[PDB]
Design a protein around this ligand. Structure first.
Ligand SMILES: Cc1cc2nc3c(=O)[nH]c(=O)nc-3n(C[C@H](O)[C@H](O)[C@H](O)COP(=O)(O)O)c2cc1C
Length: 104
């Protein structure tokens, strides 16, 4: 499956881990994605109401399954059934965010 692990304890919640399937789907390279926020997958046609949800979840720290339109590195648009999981790996506190992308 395609997914990335982001570390919210860092500035701008950057991708610290990206599964190979992710790199395949998005056509980017690991040297390019590591350390950057995932918003780079959004484009001109990406509904902002959809991104407002994903934004609410990350802040309110909840899970969300949102269908949003993203773009590969080449410029090809594709639908992304996006699923956000909160690695509360701690004892209360949030340690990581797990994002799973499914090209629908
Ligand atoms: C682990 C993780 C994975 C994400 N994956 C995606 C993605 O594949 N596509 C997307 O459009 N946004 C994705 N996001 C959401 C954006 O990074 C960002 O939270 C959203 O664009 C709203 O925040 P901003 O207003 O700072 O851009 C992901 C967020 C997290 C925490």
């Amino acid at each position: 499956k395609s997914f990335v692990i982001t570390d919210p304890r860092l500035p701008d919640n950057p991708i610290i881990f990206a599964s190979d399937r992710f790199l395949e789907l998005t056509e980017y390279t690991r040297e390019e994605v590591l350390g950057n926020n995932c918003r780079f997958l959004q484009g001109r046609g990406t509904d902002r109401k959809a991104v407002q949800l994903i934004r609410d979840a990350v802040k309110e720290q909840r899970d969300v399954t949102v269908q949003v339109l993203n773009y590969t590195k080449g410029g090809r648009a594709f639908w992304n059934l996006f699923h956000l999981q909160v690695m509360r790996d701690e004892n209360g506190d949030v340690q990581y965010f797990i994002g799973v992308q499914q090209e629908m």
